[PDB]
Amino acid sequence: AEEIKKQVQVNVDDIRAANIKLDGLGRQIADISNSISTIESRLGEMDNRLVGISSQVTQLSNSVSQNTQSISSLGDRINAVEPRVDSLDTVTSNLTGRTSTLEADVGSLRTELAALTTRVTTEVTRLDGLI
Amino acid sequence: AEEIKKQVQVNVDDIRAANIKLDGLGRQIADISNSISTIESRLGEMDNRLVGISSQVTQLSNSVSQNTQSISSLGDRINAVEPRVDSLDTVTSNLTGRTSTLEADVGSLRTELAALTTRVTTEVTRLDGLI
Amino acid sequence: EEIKKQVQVNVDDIRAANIKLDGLGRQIADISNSISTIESRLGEMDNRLVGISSQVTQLSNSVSQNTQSISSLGDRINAVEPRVDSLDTVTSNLTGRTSTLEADVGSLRTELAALTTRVTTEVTRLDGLI
Numbered sequence: 001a002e003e004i005k006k007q008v009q010v011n012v013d014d015i016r017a018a019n020i021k022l023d024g025l026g027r028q029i030a031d032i033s034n035s036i037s038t039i040e041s042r043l044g045e046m047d048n049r050l051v052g053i054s055s056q057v058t059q060l061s062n063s064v065s066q067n068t069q070s071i072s073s074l075g076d077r078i079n080a081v082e083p084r085v086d087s088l089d090t091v092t093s094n095l096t097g098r099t100s101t102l103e104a105d106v107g108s109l110r111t112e113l114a115a116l117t118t119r120v121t122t123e124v125t126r127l128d129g130l131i
Numbered sequence: 132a133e134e135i136k137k138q139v140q141v142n143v144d145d146i147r148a149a150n151i152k153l154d155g156l157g158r159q160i161a162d163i164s165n166s167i168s169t170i171e172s173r174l175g176e177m178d179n180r181l182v183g184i185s186s187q188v189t190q191l192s193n194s195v196s197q198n199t200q201s202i203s204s205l206g207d208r209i210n211a212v213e214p215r216v217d218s219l220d221t222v223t224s225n226l227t228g229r230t231s232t233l234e235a236d237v238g239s240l241r242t243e244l245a246a247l248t249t250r251v252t253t254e255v256t257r258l259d260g261l262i
Numbered sequence: 263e264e265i266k267k268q269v270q271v272n273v274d275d276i277r278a279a280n281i282k283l284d285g286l287g288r289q290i291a292d293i294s295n296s297i298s299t300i301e302s303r304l305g306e307m308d309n310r311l312v313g314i315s316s317q318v319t320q321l322s323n324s325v326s327q328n329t330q331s332i333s334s335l336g337d338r339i340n341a342v343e344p345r346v347d348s349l350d351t352v353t354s355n356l357t358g359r360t361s362t363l364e365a366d367v368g369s370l371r372t373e374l375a376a377l378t379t380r381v382t383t384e385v386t387r388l389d390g391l392i
């Protein structure tokens with residue numbers, strides 16, 4: 001009987017102690033629920049950042065695509081200009097030769113015309129002297 | 132004895148209440164385990180998005196390097212073309228002056244040849260009249 | 263007695279509850295480890311997003327430099343093109359004028375040879391009459 005009463009007291013105190021440890025586990029679960037709520041907020045902010053970065057990459061891709069198209073257009077324009085400059089080098093070089101040839105020919109014709117002018121003066125003077 | 136029997140019955144009750152509280156905590160742990168599983172899958176979907184973005188940035192970086200090189204090549208071609216066009220403006224300016232001078236010189240030679248033609252007619256007429 | 267038996271059953275049931283409580287205590291410790299790893303993964307992912315953003319910012323500066331260089335090359339080609347069109351016009355006009363000069367000079371050369379012959383023929387004729 002004395003043994004019974006002693007053990008029943010121990011059981012009262014052990015049941016109360018177990019119930020306090022169960023309340024402690026409930027507080028640990030509440031703290032885990034707060035960690036999970038915060039993790040979920042962080043996952044939402046990271047989702048927002050990933051949307052923002054993806055938009056920046058998409059926009060940058062479009063600007064690079066526009067630059068590749070502008071470079072192709074400038075390439076077409078320089079491709080068209082280069083052979084026109086090569087052609088003009090040939091045209092002006094051939095014109096230069098023809099201008100030099102004309103300057104030599106006109107100089108020769110002027111000298112020959114001046115020699116014929118003096119020949120006319122000489123011959124008319126001579127004929128006048130015989131008459 | 133009646134006091135003992137009553138406290139043993141209350142302990143039986145309290146041990147059953149404790150076991151109901153333990154069952155409730157196990158259900159809460161099962162709910163947390165589910166949330167953790169879903170968070171771990173979300174960590175994987177975000178890892179996938181980051182892989183996709185990183186691959187887009189690598190590709191874009193290659194395109195930008197290709198464009199910077201294409202721009203330097205076009206720059207070298209325009210740098211080469213510009214002084215060739217400046218040289219052609221110099222050649223053509225100098226040929227323009229030379230062509231104008233030839234047109235004035237040929238006009239003068241034509242007038243002078245017509246004057247000598249007239250002079251030959253005048254002097255021959257005069258000499259014939261004296262004979 | 264029935265009391266003594268129930269008190270012993272209660273001892274054993276309280277120990278079974280403490281074992282189960284200790285098991286839930288270990289499961290909560292394991293969940294706390296899972297949370298710490300998840301937090302570490304979020305911190306690494308935040309860093310990766312910062313590193314990617316920095317690379318995109320640097321790449322965007324290079325793209326801006328290229329767009330600017332493209333506008334400068336555009337200005338240079340815009341200036342060249344009409345100068346090449348002008349040179350085609352000017353050289354075409356000079357070519358036409360040079361062919362006219364060559365025809366005129368050819369004509370003058372023939373006319374000068376005819377006047378040279380005429381001076382010889384007329385001087386011969388006059389000499390013959392004297």
Ligand SMILES: [Cl-]
Nearest residue numbers: 008011142272
């Ligand atoms: Cl008891």
Ligand SMILES: [Cl-]
Nearest residue numbers: 064067198328
């Ligand atoms: Cl670019």
